[PDB]
Design a protein around this ligand. Structure first.
Ligand SMILES: Cc1cccc(-n2nccc2-c2cc(Cl)c3nnn(-c4ccc5cn[nH]c5c4)c3c2)c1
Ligand SMILES: Cc1cccc(-n2nccc2-c2cc(Cl)c3nnn(-c4ccc5cn[nH]c5c4)c3c2)c1
Ligand SMILES: [Ca+2]
Ligand SMILES: [Ca+2]
Ligand SMILES: [Zn+2]
Ligand SMILES: [Zn+2]
Ligand SMILES: [Zn+2]
Ligand SMILES: [Zn+2]
Lengths: 514, 515
């Protein structure tokens, strides 16, 4: 028995087609993704293959003005139009709190929304009762396929799920659900969830009975053969895990931003065991037409977004590299721009720290360099503030150690900086990777870079998200000596752009590796 | 027979008292120098010692709005009021061309103006005939003292002397003059000139008959004992040179900006030979009152300068280190500010800048509520030049950086301040092979980043007009540039940028490093 799994993850409000770097589509002839194009490709597959599931591994929420304005109503509407079979809850589904998940998405989705490791307590349990499920058993032809969901345990430190939701360990929560499905004689099981490639591999290895893992969160690009675009594969597609019960378990992911449609054909035997699997993510480029009906509908919804001040904030003469591949791995010029905008606005303190996880998109310079509120809103969508903090040198050294504690998983804690020169030696044990850390002096008439002192006290401008233990920066929350509330993130950056008129941030050597 | 030599050099338009870093005087109680205070100290010495000479070793011209507005008329007036006995021509006396030297200073000075190594050719020879001299024989009591002048051979690469003036080798030019003085039975000889401490020492060693050398140009601070301020001595005061004809020759210098009055008391025998000498530069601090008559006169002249837009250009929250001790030796934040102002104004793609320490003329203090005015800025950038665009081979650029440190340690002007460049020097290496690392901001990239310079590659650089014209000995820029577009006015580029930024805070970032 053959099953085709079509899968998307981390779409992040890319409802319209985008540039290849997934920023605003300007040169339409080279644009990719969008729901209109995705619908065309899905329909081509559903008409050719009999047993097809369309799955989403979370993080449909947040990324563009579509979400800022429609707050999830666009997600329900277009996922319904595309007829998704199931979606796993991602961390970003909680960005507008539980009330922002329940009302526009859980109540309007015409498909099951899943998460086996999220448990509701207090008065909320009765409200959210049955709105999301641990699993769904779906009929596929004359067969039945069990889909069991999971959401990152880290969501309380990355989003706003509230206090009445408990995030259990994925493996611990999944095992009883898979076991229940086996007693219900459901012999084919897909674990669909949002915890990142490393947890996906662990789930594949340790949850007895899982046949396939469809993930997200890490924006992992997997490919078999020569890749069709700029994304570099982390491994083959599918990635094969050898389980503890001795089975070969395919693990798949499809990058992010709706640029690819994941495609895996699985051959099961009569007893539900995977004989083989093959596929590859499909590049949703210009050669695939945008469905006319979906595109007409997208255009209808776009009208309300066309009200956003098309007025130029200023110009960039350089590519503003706010891509995750850069900003979560190394010094990125968009990170330097925001940290210098933060420092500047405050003076109008010379040290700044900014988590890569909060830099959500690049901005392209080829449109006569024009930066609009729409371009910027995709970079900084969270509506947070840039706050002032007084920190011990030891607290800062610990924050920098945390910044690279699990380097290489495309996690959000990597720090972008201002007034700091940090050198990392990744070959060293986690918690001992910071080999050099120089900071801009304050008790000096002429600023210069001097080695950080553990027993010294520094004034730093950082997002309120980091002062509140976001991205696992518990040491900042627990050890800070002062915390003053600041100005709105996006307004700080637009004003600075309007003041500078022409911007050109560079990669200068603020962050180095040894 | 005893002679006291009082000497100033590199006053650079510091007619008014200044802060200790020789920028605008704000906190008067701690201010130093100025001509009013100098007059009090000179008077105290002239009334105590019978045989006194007051000498200037050049570079009275250029430094503050006093010169911008009065163009040398303030120099003639206040040097005359202080009754200088002689002045040597410095390179800065040529900043307004020969016509700017002749008309306000040579014609109005009530004292001889000297230079034995400057020769006039063409039609100019008849015009300047007798306006400056190779030497002057001055009566001092019942004795006569010969003073022979000299000016840096480098003046054509530093200023505007024109094409009708030839700068000969100092030693070659001085020897016939000293010999002529000996035949005129002038047995006491002072070489007063502007070529820098290293040449002063050479003059003392090799010019037969020179008893004392009084110099300038290198802003050398010499002191015997514990120094009274922040200037660190280069050697004892006087510095003793053992001449080739076996004599002990004192060499003196008195820093710059009118902060100190050089003071050397010499014991000569009957035949004019120095028996001994002793002294020290005198710190012109608050302990010395400003002469009331000179100060009243200074205030009278100040009125015309107040007319200068007292309006705030913007604010600094950091000390703008434009001191020569910094900008000619290492990365200085005033250098980074000007190079970033240059790059910025031009964009409002070129991301590389080079700026000689020689063109940075003063720091700016941040303690006056951070206020930057046109007067503060005019002291930093007084030359009225432009910031121009140049297309250079990597090899040309590597040669410029080698030149920047070819004779490092003499407080010469060729040291380069930078923008969009990270350069590392190893000074232990032979001159012409000191640049050990040179990374530049890419241009053929969407994201700018520092990549190693390539000898066969072509870069676009913003630099002063002066450097593109082979100023400071940068002959390789003039001769090898592939394109040279004229730019915007130096000072306007920097004020506009300050007005745009509102609050500035340049830093020392590691653009220049040593190994
Ligand atoms: C814990 C906390 C405090 C304050 C606010 C929040 N919320 N609530 C709702 C939304 C946010 C929020 C806001 C701001 Cl300013 C962020 N910047 N980065 N980041 C973020 C997001 C997702 C991942 C994934 N890996 N790393 C990440 C970082 C933000 C999340 C949470
Ligand atoms: C050769 C040349 C070209 C263009 C103009 C000039 N004149 N003319 C008249 C005045 C200048 C001039 C102007 C500018 Cl923008 C300068 N910046 N630095 N610098 C200078 C001055 C003195 C020393 C001593 N060591 N280093 C030094 C550098 C300048 C000289 C000459
Ligand atoms: Ca199975
Ligand atoms: Ca003699
Ligand atoms: Zn995501
Ligand atoms: Zn996620
Ligand atoms: Zn001078
Ligand atoms: Zn000079």
């Amino acid at each position: 028995w053959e099953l085709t799994i079509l899968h998307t993850n981390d779409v992040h409000s890319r409802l319209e087609q985008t540039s290849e770097d997934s920023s605003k589509c300007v040169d339409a002839s080279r644009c990719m993704g969008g729901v209109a194009r995705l619908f065309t490709k899905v329909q081509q597959i559903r008409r050719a293959e009999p047993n097809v599931l369309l799955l989403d591994a979370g993080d449909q929420y947040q990324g563009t003005i579509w979400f800022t304005v429609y707050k999830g109503a666009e997600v329900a509407h277009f996922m319904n139009a595309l007829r998704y079979d199931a979606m796993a809850l991602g961390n970003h589904e909680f960005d507008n709190g539980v009330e922002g998940l329940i009302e526009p998405l859980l109540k309007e989705a015409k498909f099951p929304i899943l998460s086996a490791n999220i448990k509701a307590k207090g008065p909320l349990a009765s409200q959210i009762s049955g709105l999301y499920l641990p699993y769904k058993v779906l009929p596929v032809g004359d067969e039945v396929v069990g889909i069991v969901g999971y959401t990152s345990k880290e969501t309380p430190f990355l989003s706003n799920p509230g206090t009445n939701l408990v995030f259990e360990d994925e493996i611990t929560a999944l095992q009883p659900e898979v076991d229940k499905l086996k007693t219900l004689n459901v012999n084919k099981i897909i674990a669909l969830g949002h915890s990142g490639f490393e947890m996906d591999k662990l789930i594949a290895q340790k949850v007895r009975g899982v046949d396939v893992v469809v993930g997200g969160h890490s924006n992992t690009f997997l490919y078999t053969g020569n890749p069709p675009s700029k994304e570099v594969p982390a491994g083959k597609y599918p990635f094969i895990v050898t389980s503890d019960d001795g089975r070969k378990v395919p693990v798949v992911q499809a990058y992010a931003f709706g640029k690819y449609l994941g495609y895996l054909k699985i051959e099961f035997d009569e007893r539900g065991n995977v004989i083989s699997s093959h596929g590859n993510p499909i590049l949703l480029d210009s050669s695939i037409p945008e469905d006319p009906s979906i595109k007409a509908d997208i255009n209808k919804w776009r009208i309300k977004l066309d009200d956003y001040s098309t007025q130029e904030l200023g110009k960039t003469i350089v590519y503003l590299d706010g891509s995750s591949q850069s900003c979560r791995f190394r010094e990125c010029n968009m990170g330097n721009l925001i940290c210098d905008a933060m420092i500047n606005n405050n003076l109008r303190v010379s040290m700044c720290i900014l988590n890569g996880g909060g830099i959500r998109s690049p901005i392209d310079e080829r449109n006569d360099g024009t930066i609009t509120w729409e371009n910027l809103a995709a970079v900084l969508p969270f509506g947070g503030t840039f706050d002032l903090v007084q920190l011990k040198g030891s607290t800062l050294k610990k924050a920098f150690e945390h910044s690279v504690h699990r380097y290489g998983q495309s996690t959000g804690e990597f720090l972008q900086v201002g007034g700091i020169h940090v050198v990392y030696d990744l070959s060293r044990k986690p918690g001992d990777r910071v080999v050099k850390l120089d900071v801009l002096c304050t008790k000096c008439r002429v600023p210069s870079y001097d080695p950080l002192k553990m027993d010294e006290v520094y004034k730093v401008i950082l997002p309120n998200f980091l002062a509140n233990g976001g991205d696992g920066f518990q040491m900042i929350k627990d050890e800070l000596l002062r915390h003053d509330s600041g100005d709105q993130d996006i307004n700080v950056v637009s004003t600075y752009i309007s003041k500078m008129k022409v911007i050109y941030p560079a990669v200068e050597g603020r962050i180095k590796f040894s």
